[PDB]
Each structure stands twice: as structure tokens, then as C-alpha cells.
Design a protein around this nucleic acid. Structure first.
Lengths: 230, 23, 108, 95, 75, 97, 274, 79, 80, 97, 98, 93
DNA sequence: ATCAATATCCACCTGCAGATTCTACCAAAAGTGTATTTGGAAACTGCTCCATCAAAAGGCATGTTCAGCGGAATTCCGCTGAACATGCCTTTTGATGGAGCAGTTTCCAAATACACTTTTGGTAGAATCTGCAGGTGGATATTGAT
DNA sequence: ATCAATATCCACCTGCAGATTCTACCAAAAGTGTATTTGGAAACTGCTCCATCAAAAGGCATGTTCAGCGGAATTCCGCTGAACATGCCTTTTGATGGAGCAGTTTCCAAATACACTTTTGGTAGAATCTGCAGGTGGATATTGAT
């Protein structure tokens, strides 16, 4: 017995002898398609953004227990926006909270820090929104859903009611020992389940800000069109 | 007054598009 | 079955001591292994079993139960790896393999 | 007075295919074949043991002889069956 | 840390930044021709100014770390 | 008084002489030629019958090898004719001097 | 098996066991999405995430969009989180992979079905930046969310024109699982019959392995499963067996949805880091 | 005596007809006799040396198959 | 691990062919003369590595190349 | 600029490389070539530098022999240049096996 | 006194005798058969040696490079056949134009 | 321990036109030259005396091996010089 | 296109060489048993020589370009081979008369094996000599456009 | 027929590494004579096996004719040598660094070698059995006349 090799021939003919139902209020909206196929280059954390949600356990003290006679309309969006802000904001100025959430630090020395915060430069737009002068509106993306033409920003609730948001935030970090309430993953380690600069690339700044000053007047070549309508 | 900004920027595209994107 | 063998302990059909003596008569050096020339017994057994397996491949071309020389070339020339291990050899009364070069035939 | 390999070829053929004949022209063909390939692989093993500065032809130089003098795939078949038979010769038990 | 790798990450995200630059401005110019024959009455200019407002956002997010490599290596 | 296409029974003798395997060159002229080339080295070179048959076989093998060689050379020349120089290049590249 | 995976419309108790519950040995359900497929055992984190939905195409470039499906390419270094999210999805369905590193290096090719509601990423296979085995399929999975339709075969149709443009031959790895064991041999066989119903002249084993780019140690062993390889008639003979006579007719009278080798917006990428 | 012209035209026609040629030139006969005679002296010389070293005033089959082996055109079946 | 395409060596095929006695080249022979080169290389290199494998040595000498080319039929001459 | 007849500096460089005894192929890419053709037969094994020169010399000699006899086939085929059918006739007629 | 000059040559009879002993397979050879043999390699070396006084009046190269060995070992056309096995290391080719 | 025919080749060169000089790469190629012809005639002599059923590797088998190992005219003056040398050795006892 | 016209193939009597086998006898070895020297597994240990590593200089690799010319093609023009047919020289296939191949003996010259003495062929130390690589500055072939 | 820039030859010349021609030494094998086997030289015959001469038949020699096939012209155009100008991997060239060689020493398998002995594979040949090569009748495959 052997295995065949190259060069050989071919002789064909000559004579040898459970469809789920409650999905309708989850996935809404339509989505167009273009004759050019999609090209995309962004991350999925920027497609979600505010990386915390608060469950049924603590919305029931915020939605129907705060709003008895609360003068400011304290809605559930900033109940998720502002709470997720200092979930972040405590951790970049204290990265060692894990072994002791009995070391839950106080706002009375956090009180200038998170007010001037720029959360991994979260407000990267408003200084450049100066150049497009779209402060009549705000900045809207396709990376932003249809529920943010009515939202309200951060600082003018922290001294108002944001003194009473980190209060309930603390006590369920000690039962989970200093992590997110639906905890992060098995992230601790991949363990168990359960002179060349000098000559050519010295113009790499110049390579791409040719488009950045291009970007606003090609955003103004349509911002001559949404003031055309007014 | 909605269009007196439309009548000067449109050449800054071509003055820039023939600056780097047309060598 | 028995305590005596003819060095049949290789699954072989060849003589061990005969090609032991025939390796001994090339005698450039001085010493040849006796217990491990058996790999050379079954070396000759390997490519000779394959050469005669090829003869049963073409004994049934023509319902011909013996084996002859011109269609022993026909098997040795159509196995490619046995071709160049025999390409220096000319099988006597062998004929040639039929290959009309295709650029000659123009259907005329 | 002459020694030949013809009955060994014959018993190889009849153990492969029990009813097939041989013309003695082809018997001389195969005998010349095995004698020539013997001389080729023996002079290869002899010169390899010569310039490798050794004094005894053993299983390793005849193994590299069957490797070097055969083309590839039947050389692999040959070294496999060769190791098979040379470990069946070493298996010397009571039964 | 080194110039051989700071050109690395900035050239494969701007390998496909000219993908979207050859994709995203072309689709903004795809539907605006209907607004010449608009002569949807109040909302179809709203969508195209959103997904070209993203045309200057995704190119903007590379920039915040882009200039600090120029400074923190040459210091 | 009828004949087929002139020039296509060459294919017929191609097929019928490749199907066969007998020796082509006739035995008595070949014996005379091998004795003629034997006499001008040494007189009275007695011969064996199977020896001269082996000479005939080796002659037939060398000549048919050179013939398929010059076949391939001439058909590389975009030409069905084999000439002198077809055999010349066949021999010169085959390795003979 | 742990707390049946409800997602989209199809509910799944999974085929395999537990890569997932480090903090989840407590719940009764797990919710999965389509584009992010962000794992959410709780409900309130999941329905608020659908009011945080922005992504309506998986994060990469497209190379196909036929009448029925579309194909992507999403690299594991440029997406940290999302590529490891669907590492969870197949490992509940196929246990013959490794979580042994939090998987960076390789490229995902993943496939959905078009809906105006939105695409739904309905199968993938990984692809590493190296050729040791040839590696043209690393870890394929049609998923039982939507399994019972033969477009899971079309992933193997999609598998080989990758190897046509990349010009290096390849085969998937050694841990073959049973759902792919039947699927791999059906495409190896039915491509062999296509280049023999054409090509009226002789065929070497080099240019079956170059015209279709199945490796020779596979394509000889799949010709012997077809029993199309017999010797003893003057060569190694190819020899029509009369089940061919309906089987070229099977894809010419009962034609299938296929791919094309020309509609590929893809260049083989050049790599600096390893 | 002179008999290299004995190897006739239909014999060499058939011998080229096995080789697969089609169009014999009218004067290829002379150089095919020449290459024939050349191969003949190249085999007859070493046949004579083997039969002369063996002190044997007849030429067997074995010495010419040995001499044909050494030139590099070995023959199987006759030795 | 340099398993990369440096089988594209060099168009000094128009320097070796000029060492040959040939005039103009007409292109496209570069790929198949590299194919001849690769076949020749692996044919010699297999025999050389069998010699150094039988020597129980992890280097090849010039003697191994001379011996491999000696069996090959084309003997490199005056090198060892 | 002054430029000769197209064809005669080919004759000048033919004459220069007929007089030349230079090693033609450069040492470093050919050395990496023999590295990368040896490592698939056996993982990392040391090379002696004279063995690299030996492979170099053998490959250059075989390539110039192949170019000489493909030139002889090329002038046989009534052309002054070479193509794939010339190198294929050269390889088949030389008998690589 | 020595056996080398007693046959009238310069190559050693006694060394190359031992070489044939280590290259033997019939185990036995006369010392007299080295004498025919030692002058065969003496003749076959001197024949190559004296013909690389090739062109030495018009280039006066009183040494020899290795192409000086090659570029007349082929012109001695009977010695082309006996060295056709050989490829001369760094030797070049003969000047010849088709 | 080293072994070479080199000084033998030097006295060959002074036995012919003596004013000149071998280069030590051409000396190595002359060494491989005489070594190769030694190998060829040695294996042919051993094979000839092998199948001609003798045991003594004799002188006339070297004569016939050198008549068949070399091309014609250099073979005939080589065998003439070799017989002259073996006669001028055997003539002194 | 539709038959003619062979000639390929195919299925089938038949007359032996021709495997072939089985005995059968047997000259020549193969497997065994057991002393007996030695080649070899390989183990440790310098150290030679390769393997990267890198830094500047720099000849050559490689597009991009053009001009023209040497290769694929069509047509035709003359002829040298293929192909019957008639005749036939020569061979194939059959029969008898002598030399060297093979084999078996004898004896002596030559080769093996050994203990000896002494020079040859080898470094390496390298001093020493000097011929070739490469340089360079006047007369001398040598080709494209006019 | 001629200009004229491009590149060659040759004498004279400067460096420098390569050859060579020693002495020390040095030691490891070649040459000397002894003694025993032993195979080669040679003389002898036994007898196959190789030389050579007579009938049928068959393929071979040689025409005559027909004609596709070399082969030459002319044309047109893809493609390919020759150049500019620029990069870029190469070529040194240290220069260091580490890791498989090649030893010396080393203590055991193991093939060799002797005598013995019982099959055993060579061959002879005869039986007899027949597979196959040879011949015959006939379906039909492939392709020429008009």
C-alpha cells in the first residue's frame, strides 16, 4: 500500500468492466444600507459609553421613592449618568480600593476633584464645539441614541442632589468587596473558570490636521443647511 | 444672513484639496 | 510453536545469512552487523513486494494470469517514485509506454 | 553451481497474490533488479561508514542508506517496515 | 516608548480612517441631492447632519493621546 | 485501386509498433555489423548468441531514447520534420561528445 | 448547562458547561444581545442597555453582502472587549477551544443575516496571524440560536476564497468536532466533483491543490472517501462512478446559493508586530 | 565487410516510428547510422577489455552487461 | 523564524545568464528559474542533512556538501 | 544623453562576464535562502561558512550550465531570445531524474 | 633506498599502497601493482600540470589562479571527458560565443 | 592528524617547468583531482577483480582498469608510462 | 451525409513449449553453543567558531521611461517525402563438423603478519621575499548620426 | 565616406598579504628481514557449443505520383533592452557572546571465530496440465468519394 503522487491522468467514461415573544420592546428602529459597503473603525465601549447600569434593586429607591415630593425632576437617566460618573471618578484617584471597601473615601475631600473632572477627557467636544458654534444645539452622534436631546449635564446636580447619590453607592460595594455589582469578569489573570524618528516621520502632526480644519467646514457645509431650515 | 457664510468657505476646500490631496 | 527458527523472526520471505554474506563480500571496512542486517532483509522485501503488487495491477489488464517482461516495464514506468529508482535501467523486451505527443495530433 | 533468489521472489508473489504466474524472463528481470539495488545500497552503506570514521556497519548506516538511495515516500514505507521487522527480530521471549 | 511603535498604532487606525474618509463623506453626499429636489420636510437634514457630525468625532478621539506621545518621548 | 488519406497511416504504424515489443533490427545484419566492429580491435573474437541479442537490445533502447529526444526537439522547433540539427542538439544536450 | 440562554428569539440551554459563571453561580436567566452581545444575567442591566443601543453592525469592515447573509472581519487587538464577548458565545456551544489567554492575537470572520430590524451575528470562525497548520479555519461554529438552515455550510464556502486570495493553502486544525466532522467532508467532496465535471483533460495533484487550494494530505484522503482514485488501468484512474451522474445534476438541477471569487473587497494585510 | 549500411531504411523507419516521430528527413539515415556506429564502438571497446582481462577468447553476455553497466546504460534481464 | 518569501532573491538572473553565453532574456523565466533553483536546493539540502544526521552532528561541514554533490552526479571539486 | 545601439552593451557585458571569475549571487540573501530551505527538513542546525560558499558555487555552476544549454536550444528554435519553452526543453532533455 | 625512487617517480609507493588496502575488498594486493598505479597518478597529474603553462608569454602570470587551471583543462579536449564529473571551484567558463 | 599529497604536487611542478608557483586553492583542487581519480580507479579495480573471481588485486587488472577508465590517447601513453615504471622497478631486485 | 472499405477488436478452436511442481537426492551452507578481543555508548570538558548585534558607507537594486526591433502571424511557392505496386535479394529457418570454457588437479612465488630501526612529512614560528590587486596616465580600437 | 566621445591596452608603480623556504622537532608510520600459509600460474582434458552450408517467403528496393509541409517575405507591435535618479539592503568590521564540537578517558555489548550438525534450497527431470500464442469467423470503429 502506498500514497499517490504527481503528473497523473483522468479517465471519465470509456468502457471499464421556542420563538421568544417579549423581544418587541427591545429591538426597535430601522437601519439603512448603502451601495458602498460599511467601513467602521471604533470600539464597542464608545458604542455603549456610560459603563454602569443600576438594577431593579436600587432604581426602586430612586424612581418611586425620591419622586414623592422632589422639587427637581430627578429622572432615571441622570440616575444612571451621575452615578456612573463617580463609579469611575473615585477609582482613577484611588486605584487600591479592592482589599478594603471599608476604606470608602469621603466626598468632603473629593468635593473639588470630580467637579473639575474630565473623565479620560470625556468633554473632548465642547472646546472644539467652539469652532463649529453648535452650542445652540449640543453635539449628537450616531454613537448617541435618540434619548439625548432632552438630557441635562452633571455639575448642576452634584451640589444639588449628587450629595445624596454616593450615599447608597457605598454600602453594596462592601458586599461585593469593591467591584461592579455585575462584576467585571475573570480578569485577574488568564486562569481558571468559575534615530529612525529623525528623518521621515517628523511631520506626523502635519499629516492629519489637514483634515481637522477640513472637518468643521465640511460640517459647516451642512451647518449651512440646518440653519437654512429655520 | 444664513448664507453669507456659504459664499466664502467653498473655495477653502479646493484651496486645501489642491494643497495636499492633489500633488 | 518450536524453539528453532531459520531466522524467520522478521515476517520475511528472504534469506538472512545469504545477504549477510553478500554484505560481507563488499568488505571495505571490517565488521558487519548480523542481528541488524535484518532491516536490510526487509528493505529488499519492501520494494520487491511493491514491484510485484504492481504486477497484479496489470495482470488484470488483459485477463493474463502469468507475468511477462513488456508489461513489467509498464508497471515500473507508471509508478513515479519507482520510475526514477529504475530510470537508469532498460527493461529488455519491454517496449515503450504509449504517449503520442499532443501537439502532433491535429485530427487530420 | 549457482545461487539465485528466484524462489524467494516466487514465494513473495504467491503470498501476495496466490494465483499469478511468472515468466523466467521476468524472473531474470527481478533478480537483476534486486542484485543491482543491493550493490547500490551496499556501496552507499560502505562509503558512509567509511568517511563517518566508524568501524562497523550497523542499523543506523543502512537506515540512512535506505533513506538516501530511495526517493521519498517509498523510503518512508521502507524505514517503517524496516523498523517493524528489526524490532520483531529483537522480540526473543519464551513464546 | 519608541518611535518604531508609535507609528505602528497610529497607522493601522489611520489605515481605515481613510476607509471611512472614503466612506462617510460619500454617503453624506449621497442623500443631499434629494434636497435639491426637496423644492422629511423638517427632519431629513437632521439625520445627515448627525452622521457627518460623527465624521469629525471619530477622527477627534485619536488626538487626545496623539500629541502627548510627541511630548513625553522628547522630554 | 483506393487509398485513404495519404499521411495518416503513419499514426497506424505508431500505434501498432508501440503496442508490440519485439526487436526491430534484423538479427543477421546486426551480427555482421557487430563482427565488423569487432574485427578492427582484435581478430577472431568469438561471440555468444545471447550476448549479441543483448547488444541488439541496448542498441534498440539507445536509439529509441534518441528518437523521442529528437521528436521533442523538432516539435519544439514548431515543425513536424526531424532534421540533422534536431539530432545534433539532442545528442549535444543529452551529454554525449 | 447553566440557566438557559435566552437571546433574540431562540432560547438555548447550552450544549456545554461553564466558562462564564465566576460571579454568576446565582441567577436563573442570562440575556445576550446581537451586536455587542453584552452578557447580562440581570434584566435591568439588559433592558437599559437596549436603551443604550447605538451599534447596529458588528465592529469591523464588510467584504460580502449577498442576497441572504453578509461577512465581516473584526480583529482582536483593535477590539479588546467585543472579541472576547463572542468568545463566550461559542464556548457555551463548543468546548474544544482554549481560554488559556484572554484571546488577543487572531482575526475574526463573522456572519449575520440582513434584517431592517438589524443584523444578527449568526456564526463565525477565528483566524490566526500565522500559518503552522495552514490555519484557514480555526474555530467554526454555526450556532443553535439559528442552526436549522444550510448557511452554516456557506461558512465553509466562505472559508476557501480566503485561501484563494491569500495564495497559501490551508486546512482547519486537529480538534475536529462532530458537528463539523459531517460538515467538513461534505464540502471537500462536493468541490472535488465540480472540478472534474469540468476540465476534460488530465489533472495533476498539484493543480487540484492550486485550483481549489485544499491541501494534498487532505485532498487525497477525501478522494479516497469518494472512492474516485482507482489504480490498475495504466495510471491512477479517476473513473466516473454513476452516482456522479445525479450529483453534478444535484447542483445543476437543485442549485444552491453560493459565493463568488470576484466580489471581494479585500486586500491581504501586511503586518509589522507579532 | 562494409555493412553499417546494412541497417536498412524500413528498419530505422520503424525504430523511429516507435519513438513517436512523424516526418523522416531524406538524409537523417546517415547520421543515425553514425550515432549507431558510435554507440557500437563505445560498447565494443569495453566488451573487448572485459573479455581480454578475463583471458577469454569468446565474449559472453556477462562481460558486455558489465561493460554496459559501467557506461551508464544498464540492462536488466540478461545478467 | 524567517519562514518568509525570500525565495525572491534577486534579478541577477541577468548576471548569471550573462555569465552564460545568452543574449536578451524576454522575461518571465525568472519565476521558473527560481523554481529550478528551489528544486536543486532542496535536492542537495536533503542529502546534506541526512549526512549530518547520520554524523550525529548539529552542523553541516563542507565535507557534507561535497559528499552530497558527489552522490548527486555533479561533484563540487577542490573544496574539501 | 549619449546612448548606444540597444543590443551592443549586452555584448559588452557578455564579454565582461566571460572574462569574469566573480561569484555572482550575493552572499547574504542566498545564505538566508539556504537557511530557510534547510529549517523545514530539520529545526535549527548550524551552518559553517565554507559550506555556504560550497552551496553558492554548486548552484551558480548548475544555473550557468542550464543557461548555456537553454541558449543552444534557443538558437536552435530560430530565435535570439529565451522563454519558458526553451527552459522546459532544456530541463526535459537534460533528464533531471 | 626508499621504494619511491626505485620505480622512478616522486609519488610515494608505500602510502598509496596502504590507501588501496583501506579501499580493498579482495584483501590482497602485490606491492608491484602499486608501481604501475603510482605512476598512473603521476602521469595523470603531470599531464594536467604541464598544460597549465598555457598563455604565460603574453600575460606572464608566474602563479596560477584556479581559472588558469580550468581555462585550459577544457581545451585539452581528451581531458574534458575524464573531468566532466567535476565543477571547478571559482573557475569561470571558456570564452565562447554562439 | 593531517594528510595531503601537496609536496608531491610541488615536486611534480618542479619536475616540469620549475620557475612558477601553485596557489593554495589550486593546490587543494589538484588534491581533489588526484583523489577523485584514485577513488574511481580503486573502486573499478576492486569491482573488476571481484566479479572476475580472483583474490589478489593484481597489476594487469590495474592495467585494464586504467585502459577502460580513461579516454583513448591519454590512456595509451599513460599505460605505456606505467608499464615502463613497473619494468624499471622489477628489473632491480 | 451516407454508405464503402478496411482493420480494430472480440469471442472462440487448437497445438504445443513451458512454467511448474514434486519428488528427491544431496553439496553446501545457516543456526547453534560457546570462548574471546575490541569497537563503541557516552560521559565530562575545554574552546573554537558560529550567532547575533550593531553602525556607517556605499555599490548596486529597482521602478519609470522610451525607442525600435526582434518575435507571432499570413500567405504562397516549390519540393521532398509518404504511399501503392512490382519485382527480388536476402534472410529466416532448418541441417552437420571442430576449438576453447569450464573444471580439476600440482607447486612456488609472492603478501600477510611481526618486531624492529630510522627518515618523511608534517606542522607552526614567521622571517623574509616579492608577485598580484588595484591605480593611473599616454596612444588606440570602436561604434551612431550625417 | 566621416566626425568624435567612450572605453581599452600597457608601461610604470605602490602596497601587503600570500607563498616559500627554512630550523626545531617530532613522531608516526614506511623499509628490512623472517616463516607460513596460499592462491595464482600452468598443464591437463570433456564436451558442450560455436562455427559454417541448402529451401520458401517476406519484407525490402525502387520506382511514379500527389501533395501537405518546410521555409521565405513582409508586415506589425508588444516587449524589452538601456538610463536616471533614487533608496536600501549589503558589505564590511569590530566585537562581543554562547554552545555544539572533538577530544581523552572510559568501562561493557557484541560481532568474530572456532567446531558441529541437520536441514535445505539447487537442480533434474518427468508428469501432466495448460496458458497462451496462433489461427479463424465476425460485430464494428473510423473515416474517404461526391
Amino acid at each position: 500500500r502506498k500514497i499517490s503522487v504527481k503528473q497523473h491522468l483522468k479517465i471519465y467514461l470509456p468502457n471499464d468492466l421556542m420563538t421568544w415573544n417579549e423581544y418587541d420592546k427591545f429591538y426597535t428602529g430601522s437601519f439603512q444600507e448603502t451601495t458602498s459597503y460599511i467601513k467602521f473603525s471604533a470600539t464597542v465601549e464608545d458604542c455603549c459609553g456610560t459603563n454602569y447600569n443600576m438594577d431593579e434593586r436600587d432604581e426602586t429607591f430612586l424612581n418611586e421613592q425620591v419622586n414623592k415630593g422632589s422639587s427637581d425632576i430627578l429622572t432615571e437617566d441622570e440616575f444612571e449618568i451621575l452615578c456612573s460618573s463617580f463609579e469611575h471618578a473615585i477609582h482613577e484617584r484611588q486605584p487600591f480600593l479592592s482589599m478594603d471597601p471599608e476604606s470608602i473615601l469621603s466626598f468632603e475631600e473629593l468635593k473639588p476633584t470630580l467637579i473639575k473632572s474630565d473623565m479620560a477627557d470625556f468633554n473632548l467636544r465642547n472646546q472644539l464645539n467652539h469652532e463649529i458654534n453648535s452650542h445652540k444645539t449640543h453635539f449628537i452622534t450616531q454613537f448617541d441614541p435618540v434619548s439625548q436631546m432632552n438630557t441635562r449635564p452633571l455639575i448642576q446636580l452634584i451640589e444639588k442632589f449628587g450629595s445624596k447619590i454616593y450615599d447608597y453607592w457605598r454600602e453594596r460595594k462592601i458586599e461585593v468587596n469593591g467591584y461592579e455589582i455585575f462584576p467585571q469578569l475573570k480578569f485577574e489573570r488568564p486562569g481558571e473558570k468559575e534615530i529612525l524618528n529623525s528623518q521621515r516621520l517628523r511631520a506626523l502632526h502635519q499629516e492629519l490636521k489637514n483634515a481637522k480644519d477640513l472637518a468643521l467646514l465640511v460640517a459647516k457645509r451642512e451647518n449651512v443647511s440646518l440653519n437654512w431650515i429655520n | 444672513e444664513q448664507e453669507d457664510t456659504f459664499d466664502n468657505l467653498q473655495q477653502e476646500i479646493y484651496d486645501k484639496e489642491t494643497e495636499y490631496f492633489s500633488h | 510453536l518450536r524453539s528453532q527458527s531459520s531466522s524467520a523472526r522478521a515476517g520475511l520471505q528472504f534469506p538472512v545469512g545469504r545477504i549477510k554474506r553478500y554484505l560481507k563480500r563488499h568488505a571495505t571496512g571490517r565488521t558487519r552487523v548480523g542481528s541488524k542486517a535484518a532491516i536490510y532483509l526487509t528493505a529488499v522485501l519492501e520494494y520487491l513486494t511493491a514491484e510485484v503488487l504492481e504486477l497484479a495491477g496489470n495482470a488484470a489488464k488483459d485477463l493474463k494470469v502469468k507475468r511477462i517482461t513488456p508489461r513489467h516495464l509498464q508497471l515500473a514506468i507508471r509508478g513515479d517514485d519507482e520510475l526514477d529508482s529504475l530510470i537508469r535501467a532498460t527493461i529488455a523486451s519491454g517496449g515503450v509506454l504509449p504517449h503520442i505527443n499532443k501537439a502532433l495530433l491535429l485530427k487530420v | 553451481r549457482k545461487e539465485t533468489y528466484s524462489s524467494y521472489i516466487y514465494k513473495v508473489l504467491k503470498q501476495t497474490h496466490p494465483d499469478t504466474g511468472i515468466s523466467q524472463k521476468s524472473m531474470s528481470i527481478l533478480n537483476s533488479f534486486v542484485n543491482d539495488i543491493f550493490e547500490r545500497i551496499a556501496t552507499e552503506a560502505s562509503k558512509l561508514a567509511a568517511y563517518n570514521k566508524k568501524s562497523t556497519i550497523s542499523a543506523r548506516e543502512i537506515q540512512t542508506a535506505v533513506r538516501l538511495i530511495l526517493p521519498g515516500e517509498l523510503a518512508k514505507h521502507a524505514v517503517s517496515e524496516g523498523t517493524r521487522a528489526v524490532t520483531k527480530y529483537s522480540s526473543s521471549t519464551q513464546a | 516608548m519608541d518611535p518604531s511603535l508609535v507609528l505602528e498604532q497610529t497607522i493601522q487606525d489611520v489605515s481605515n480612517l481613510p476607509s471611512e474618509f472614503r466612506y462617510l463623506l460619500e454617503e453624506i453626499g449621497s442623500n443631499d441631492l434629494k434636497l435639491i429636489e426637496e423644492k422629511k420636510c423638517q427632519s431629513l437634514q437632521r439625520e445627515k447632519c448627525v452622521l457627518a457630525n460623527t465624521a469629525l468625532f471619530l477622527i477627534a478621539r485619536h488626538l487626545n493621546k496623539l500629541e502627548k506621545n510627541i511630548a513625553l518621548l522628547e522630554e | 485501386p483506393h487509398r485513404y488519406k495519404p499521411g495518416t497511416v503513419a499514426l497506424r504504424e505508431i500505434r501498432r509498433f508501440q503496442k508490440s515489443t519485439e526487436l526491430l533490427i534484423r538479427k543477421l545484419p546486426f551480427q555482421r555489423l557487430v563482427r565488423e566492429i569487432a574485427q578492427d580491435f582484435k581478430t577472431d573474437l568469438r561471440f555468444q548468441s545471447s550476448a549479441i541479442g543483448a547488444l541488439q537490445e541496448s542498441v534498440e533502447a539507445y536509439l529509441v531514447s534518441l528518437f523521442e529526444d529528437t521528436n521533442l526537439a523538432a516539435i519544439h522547433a514548431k515543425r513536424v520534420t526531424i532534421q540533422k540539427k534536431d539530432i545534433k542538439l539532442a545528442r549535444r544536450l543529452r551529454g554525449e561528445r | 448547562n447553566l440557566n438557559r440562554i435566552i437571546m433574540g428569539k431562540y432560547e438555548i440551554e447550552p450544549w456545554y458547561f461553564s466558562p462564564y459563571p465566576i460571579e454568576l453561580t446565582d441567577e436563573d436567566f442570562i440575556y445576550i444581545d446581537d451586536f455587542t452581545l453584552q452578557y447580562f444575567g440581570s434584566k435591568k442591566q439588559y433592558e437599559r442597555y437596549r436603551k443604550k443601543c447605538t451599534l447596529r453592525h458588528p465592529p469591523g469592515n464588510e467584504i460580502y453582502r449577498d442576497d441572504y447573509v453578509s461577512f465581516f472581519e473584526i480583529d482582536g487587538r483593535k477590539q479588546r472587549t467585543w472579541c472576547r464577548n463572542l468568545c463566550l458565545l461559542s464556548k457555551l456551544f463548543l468546548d474544544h477551544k482554549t481560554l488559556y489567554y484572554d484571546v488577543d492575537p487572531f482575526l475574526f470572520y463573522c456572519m449575520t443575516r440582513r434584517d431592517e430590524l438589524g443584523h444578527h451575528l449568526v456564526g463565525y470562525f477565528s483566524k490566526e496571524k500565522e500559518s503552522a497548520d495552514g490555519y484557514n479555519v480555526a474555530c467554526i461554529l454555526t450556532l443553535p440560536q439559528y442552526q436549522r438552515m444550510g448557511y452554516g455550510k456557506l461558512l465553509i464556502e466562505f472559508s476557501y476564497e480566503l485561501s484563494k486570495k491569500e495564495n497559501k493553502v490551508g486546512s482547519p486544525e486537529k480538534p475536529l468536532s462532530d458537528l463539523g466532522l459531517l460538515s467538513y467532508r461534505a464540502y471537500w467532496s462536493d468541490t472535488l466533483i465540480t472540478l472534474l465535471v469540468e476540465h476534460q483533460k488530465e489533472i495533476t495533484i498539484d493543480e487540484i491543490s492550486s485550483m481549489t487550494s485544499m491541501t494534498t494530505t487532505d485532498i487525497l484522503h477525501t478522494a479516497k472517501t469518494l472512492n474516485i482514485l482507482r489504480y490498475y488501468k495504466g495510471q491512477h484512474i479517476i473513473f466516473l462512478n454513476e452516482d456522479i451522474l445525479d450529483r453534478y445534476n444535484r447542483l445543476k438541477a437543485k442549485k444552491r446559493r453560493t459565493i463568488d471569487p470576484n466580489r471581494l473587497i479585500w486586500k491581504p494585510p501586511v503586518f509589522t508586530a507579532s | 565487410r562494409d555493412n553499417i549500411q546494412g541497417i536498412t531504411k524500413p528498419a530505422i523507419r520503424r525504430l523511429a516510428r516507435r519513438g513517436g516521430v512523424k516526418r523522416i528527413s531524406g538524409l537523417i539515415y546517415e547520421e543515425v547510422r553514425a550515432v549507431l556506429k558510435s554507440f557500437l564502438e563505445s560498447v565494443i571497446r569495453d566488451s573487448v577489455t572485459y573479455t581480454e582481462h578475463a583471458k577469454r577468447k569468446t565474449v559472453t553476455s556477462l562481460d558486455v552487461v558489465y561493460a554496459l553497466k559501467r557506461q551508464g546504460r544498464t540492462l536488466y534481464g540478461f545478467g
